[PDB]
């Protein structure tokens, strides 16, 4: 019972969830970094205050 659009996304076998999601996010990481914007140093990922 998968979705019709994302079945074509599945390509290989037994790829760990961590690597899969890391690549998912790294796509946007590279897309944003292509604009030439350096990152800023932050203590953690939440940064609520």
């Amino acid at each position: 019972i998968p979705g019709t659009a994302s079945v074509a996304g599945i390509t290989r076998m037994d790829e760990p969830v961590g690597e899969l999601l890391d690549r998912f996010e790294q796509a946007a990481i590279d897309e944003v970094l292509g604009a030439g914007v350096e990152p800023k140093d932050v203590a953690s990922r939440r940064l609520g205050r």
């Binding site: 019972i1 019709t4 079945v7 074509a8 790829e15 760990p16």
Partner: protein, 97 residues
């Protein structure tokens, strides 16, 4: 992301299920109810809600039942075909009790 993470190593889907999922390539357009496109099919559920399925024997049996369900005489007309369809799936019809 739900679908892209099915064939993951930590997932408990059957290895044959994982291989079949990798093999099938779906469509980008909408799929009409009860029809199949690009190895992908859309059929109704037990309560009538629509479902997305891969085009396999179980999906074919489900679509046939959707074609048939709703009339006892319709079930009686094509009973043996329905028996064979279930016998092809993993939830087969019991014997003639």
């Amino acid at each position: 992301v739900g679908t892209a993470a099915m064939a993951t190593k930590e997932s408990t889907t059957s290895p044959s299920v994982k291989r079949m999922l990798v093999d099938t390539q779906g469509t980008d357009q909408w799929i009409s109810a009860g029809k199949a496109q690009g190895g992908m099919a859309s059929s109704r559920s037990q309560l009538g809600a629509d479902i997305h399925e891969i085009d396999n024997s179980a999906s074919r049996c489900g679509r046939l039942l959707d074609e048939v369900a709703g009339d006892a005489e319709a079930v009686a007309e094509r009973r043996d075909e329905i028996i064979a369809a279930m016998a092809k799936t993993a939830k087969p019809y019991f014997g003639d009790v």
